[PDB]
């Protein structure tokens, strides 16, 4: 969820995200090592992921 | 930054007088300081422009663009450990 942690082990705990890019008004938020909505982890997952691409959506 | 102002007596002389020339008119004033006391007595003439404000009013400090030309005396620290030959420049 935080863009400055390129691995799960370093992606934990809270982090500061700024609303709409203004330097002021920070907002605390947690870090989640979330995967893409559609991912190629499996062959089955790949097939459904590629299906939407064939549908010109997402 | 508030810009305070205060006023105080300048001359030890007591008697003062003159004329006031606000506009197309004349006035008479005579001043006299109460001896052995911090008071001044003046007699202005009846009414016939720009308000002086001794109350502190918000204002910007001295223009820093001008003060840096002649900075106040300053004696900084005299150690500043830097420039050691036995240093590693492999970090980037």
């Amino acid at each position: 969820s935080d863009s400055s942690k390129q691995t799960e082990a370093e992606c934990k705990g809270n982090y500061i995200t700024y609303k709409d890019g203004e330097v002021d008004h920070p907002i605390i938020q947690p870090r989640s090592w979330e995967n893409s909505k559609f991912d190629f982890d499996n062959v089955l997952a790949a097939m459904m992921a590629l299906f939407t691409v064939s549908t010109f959506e997402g | 930054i508030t810009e305070q102002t205060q006023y105080f007596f300048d001359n030890d002389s007591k008697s003062f007088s003159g004329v006031l020339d606000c506009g197309n008119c004349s006035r008479i004033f005579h001043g006299e300081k109460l001896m052995n006391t911090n008071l001044i007595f003046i007699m202005v003439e009846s009414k016939g422009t720009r308000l002086l404000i001794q109350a502190e009013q918000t204002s910007d400090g001295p223009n820093p663009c001008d003060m840096v030309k002649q900075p106040r005396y300053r004696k900084g620290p005299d150690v500043c450990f830097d420039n050691n030959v036995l240093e590693d420049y492999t970090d980037c």
Partner: protein, 797 residues
């Protein structure tokens, strides 16, 4: 006749006994105060030294565990295996304390249980023993913080953290003080066409943060190259990065725009030219050039060979923003020079990156064995734990792992962190007793930079910068800006900074405590350097405050009648009475309501600093004698609304007992404007009451008068007390009318004007009434003015 100055003179004179006028030498006092403050600072330095030694020795043997799921570290995280603490409402720090362990404060954006953090917790957990050792071998020590170079903060007296927590020890001024030596910054903002949009926002925010990470003892400037290296601001050279200059640079940076074509060669040439302006009082050490840009394609090899041949200057470079431009040139520019290359992908990465160059700047001092372990006191700044004004001593702790094995191939060139101790100005103030001096006298000390330290005019609130705008910086007041500055005081300031010890006398103008009057008086300055550190404690004594009265009492019977002299129930026949909140031993210290303080003092004296209480009791006795003898006699004179007498020690007495309800003067005598002013002059002083006050006054209180009670005990001028009266307005209106007539005082405050409308608005500053009268009056060598500045004030906008 009403106040009876001569009557009090006689009352004091007849009782020659109970007086022993010791002389304030003005030199032994400053000497001893300097010695005591030096001793306190050396105590703190010793504590820091031992803490640093213990921390380094503990770090030397850690073994770097990597599986903490078992044998979990035990610590008390402030932001609430954690600990359950039992808190004692200790009044020393004004908040809950434990004294049984050192709390921790992991910044919100650092994972609590990371592998690197947990190791820091583990090896620092042994520091609590030495923390307790220090706090036990001597009390009154506020904090011991170990600002590890990972964001941690292990402060010994464990209190809950004082809403989003942005605190980060690696950015606090007391950390940057020890992390690296002073600098000569030069930020090369890249305002070129390629940085339009988000990149420019990131550049401006990062530059502002960087300027926020500069102490008040290092210089800075902000250039910019867009095929032409201009300057965003009005300075055109290095400008000390003060509290003010930072604001100018921040505004200039905020008001920039992307345009033109990038030109690194010309920009770097301009930059290297600016750092060679040796005749502008530069802090000639740690030269730096921190280029900001999106991405380059030309490495200025020729410029780096023309200037910076010997690698004198360092060059950091930020590749701010998300883009796809080449970064090889920037990395190479950082690498060739003794610098380091960073990246700022987006907001959030600014705070953790802009502060990293201090790690690089610390390499030479780390490589220096022990010449760098020098306690380095900071400048006054508001504490992060809401404690007041505290100056922090700092001492870096180095990384000694593999020492005595001579491996010397490791990351032993980076400090573990700066770890400091805190000294509160309220603690220094009790080493310089003001009560022996007259209300006008006081102490003050100044940084080498001139910034004041322990000055009466230093109020605990942020120093203002510019006018506020419609919708943490240290409290640094330059010594000339804390008082009226002239051509004489500047010489004193210059001499103190150099450490020269000498005494000077002259006649200067003092801004009264109400910021509404100015008077001429003599102020024999005196200064000396505290050899322990870099400071210059001063001392201001008027010519009439050389000698002071100290009371000696042994009968204990007169002490009794003095003890019940100021009882609350004797007011009806002895007039109301105040007592100054002075430290009469551990007696309760009052805050707002003086009545309970008087009751507590009565209880304390009934039960049983001895000289100070003796002086207060003697003053109470003499004031009671005066009031009962005379003021009880000619009660309620025709035009005397009320009568009051103020002495030293804190005895203020008002006779009618009804004017007390309309007595706005502060109970403390040393803070009473009229008292100091009345001492300053040698004639009756009239105080015009304020105008349009939410509270009552100017008709039911009356104008105030005062006159210092000069005394000659043995040929020495003394002005211990002041006797004044509050003349009723109506009676002396009747007087004046019996004789456009305007009665006025210095400061242009209408006491009366014959016209009824004017005297209706009595007390308003004359000048909102007939401005032209004064506008001409100021021109004829009467009613001059001194347009001074007050940097500590509050505004509505």
């Amino acid at each position: 006749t009403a106040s009876g100055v001569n009557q009090l003179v006689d009352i004091y004179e007849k009782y020659q006994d109970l007086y022993t006028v010791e002389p304030n030498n003005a030199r032994q006092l400053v000497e001893i105060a300097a010695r005591d403050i030096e001793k306190l600072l050396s105590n703190r330095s010793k504590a820091l030294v031992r803490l640093a030694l213990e921390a380094e020795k503990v770090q030397a043997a850690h073994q770097w565990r990597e599986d903490f799921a078992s044998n979990e570290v035990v610590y008390y995280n402030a932001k609430d295996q954690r600990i359950k603490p039992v808190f004692i409402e200790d009044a020393n720090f004004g908040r809950q304390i434990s004294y049984q362990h050192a709390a921790v404060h992991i910044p919100t954006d650092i994972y609590e249980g990371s592998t690197i953090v947990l190791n820091e917790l583990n090896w620092t957990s042994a520091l609590d023993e030495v923390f307790k050792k220090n706090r036990e071998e001597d009390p009154s020590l506020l904090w011991q913080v170990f600002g590890s170079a990972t964001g941690l903060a292990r402060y010994y007296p464990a209190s809950p953290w004082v809403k989003i927590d942005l605190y980060d020890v690696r950015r606090r001024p007391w950390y940057i003080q020890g992390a690296a030596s002073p600098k000569d910054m030069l930020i090369l903002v890249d305002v070129s066409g390629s940085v339009s949009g988000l990149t420019l926002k990131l550049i401006r925010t990062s530059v502002s943060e960087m300027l926020e990470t500069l102490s008040d003892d290092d210089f800075v400037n902000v250039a910019s190259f867009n095929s032409n290296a201009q300057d965003v601001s009005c300075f055109q050279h290095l400008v000390q990065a003060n509290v003010r200059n930072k604001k100018v640079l921040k505004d200039a940076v905020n008001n920039i725009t992307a345009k033109g074509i990038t030109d690194y060669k010309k920009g770097f040439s301009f930059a290297f030219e600016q750092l060679l302006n040796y005749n502008v009082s530069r802090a000639n050490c740690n030269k730096i050039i921190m280029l900001f840009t999106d991405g380059g394609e030309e490495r200025a090899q020729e410029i780096f060979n023309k200037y910076n041949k010997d690698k004198k200057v360092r060059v950091f470079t930020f590749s701010v923003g998300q883009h796809n431009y080449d970064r090889g040139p920037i990395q190479w520019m950082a690498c060739e020079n003794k610098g380091y290359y960073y990246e700022i992908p987006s907001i959030g990465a600014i705070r953790i990156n802009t502060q990293e160059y201090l790690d690089v700047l610390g390499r030479p001092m780390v490589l220096a064995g022990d010449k760098a372990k020098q306690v380095q006191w900071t400048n006054v700044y508001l504490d992060a734990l809401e404690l007041g004004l505290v100056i922090t001593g700092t001492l870096p702790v180095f990384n000694i792992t593999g020492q005595f094995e001579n491996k010397t191939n490791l990351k032993n060139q980076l400090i573990l962190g700066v770890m400091g101790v805190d000294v509160s100005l309220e603690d220094i103030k009790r080493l310089t007793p003001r009560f022996t001096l007259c209300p006008n006298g006081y102490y003050f000390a100044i940084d080498p930079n001139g910034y004041v330290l322990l000055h009466p005019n230093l109020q605990p609130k942020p120093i203002g910068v510019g006018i506020p705008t419609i919708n943490q910086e240290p409290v640094t007041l330059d010594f000339l800006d804390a008082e009226l500055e002239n051509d004489i005081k500047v010489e004193i300031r210059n001499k103190m900074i150099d450490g020269e010890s000498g005494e000077k006398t002259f006649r200067t103008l003092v801004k009264s405590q109400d910021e509404r009057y100015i008077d001429k008086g003599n102020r024999t300055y005196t200064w000396t350097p505290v050899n322990g550190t870099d400071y210059s404690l001063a001392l201001v004594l008027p010519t009439y405050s050389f000698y002071y009265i100290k009371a000696k009492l042994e009968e204990t019977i007169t002490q009794a009648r003095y003890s019940e002299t100021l009882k609350p129930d004797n007011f009806e026949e002895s007039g109301y009475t105040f007592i100054a909140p002075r430290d009469y031993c551990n007696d309760l210290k009052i805050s707002d309501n003086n009545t309970e303080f008087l009751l507590n003092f009565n209880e304390f004296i009934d039960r049983k600093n001895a000289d100070l209480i003796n002086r207060v009791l003697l003053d109470a006795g003499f004031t009671n004698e005066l009031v009962q003898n005379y003021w009880s006699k000619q009660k309620n004179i025709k035009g005397v609304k009320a009568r009051f007498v103020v002495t030293d020690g804190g005895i203020t007495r008002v006779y009618p007992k009804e004017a007390g309800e309309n007595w706005q003067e502060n109970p403390e005598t040393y803070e009473d404007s009229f008292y100091k002013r009345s001492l300053d002059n040698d004639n009756y002083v009239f105080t015009a009451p304020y105008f349009n006050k939410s509270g009552p006054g100017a008709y039911e209180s009356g104008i105030m008068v005062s006159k210092a009670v000069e005394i000659y005990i043995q040929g020495k001028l003394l002005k211990p007390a002041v006797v004044g009266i509050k003349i009723d307005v109506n009676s002396w209106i009747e007087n004046f009318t019996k004789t456009d007539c305007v009665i006025l005082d210095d400061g242009g405050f209408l006491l009366m004007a014959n016209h009824d409308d004017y005297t209706n608005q009595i007390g308003r500053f004359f000048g909102e009434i007939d401005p032209s009268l004064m506008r001409h009056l100021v021109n004829i060598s009467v009613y001059a003015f001194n347009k001074s500045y007050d940097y500590q004030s509050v505004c509505e906008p």
